[PDB]
Amino acid sequence: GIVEQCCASVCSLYQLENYCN
Amino acid sequence: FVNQHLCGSHLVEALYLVCGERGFFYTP
Ligand SMILES: Cc1cccc(O)c1
Ligand SMILES: [Cl-]
Ligand SMILES: [Zn+2]
């Protein structure tokens, strides 16, 4: 999930944007 | 994990900012 990718390591905004609608 | 709880709080503010008009669903 997003908590596993982005809380174990620091996501970028391009990455975060994957989880948008 | 309290650290994840804290992290998630920041994640949703980030989603809010990046997703904009699109919006988003948060599903831990
Ligand atoms: C913007 C943001 C907040 C928390 C974790 C991350 O990987 C990224
Ligand atoms: Cl924090
Ligand atoms: Zn904090």
Swiss-Prot record, chain A:
Originating species:
Bos taurus (Bovine)
Please name every pair of cysteines joined by a disulfide bond in this record: 6-11
Protein name per the record: Insulin A chain
Q: Please spell out the taxonomic lineage of the organism that makes this protein.
A: Eukaryota, Metazoa, Chordata, Craniata, Vertebrata
Residue numbers of the full-length protein present here: 85 to 105 of 105
UniProtKB/Swiss-Prot annotation, chain B:
Protein name in UniProt: Insulin B chain
Organism placement in taxonomy: Eukaryota, Metazoa, Chordata, Craniata, Vertebrata
Describe which stretch of the whole protein the shown chain covers, with first residue, last residue and complete length.
25 to 52 of 105
Protein source organism: Bos taurus (Bovine)
Its domain of life?
Eukaryota
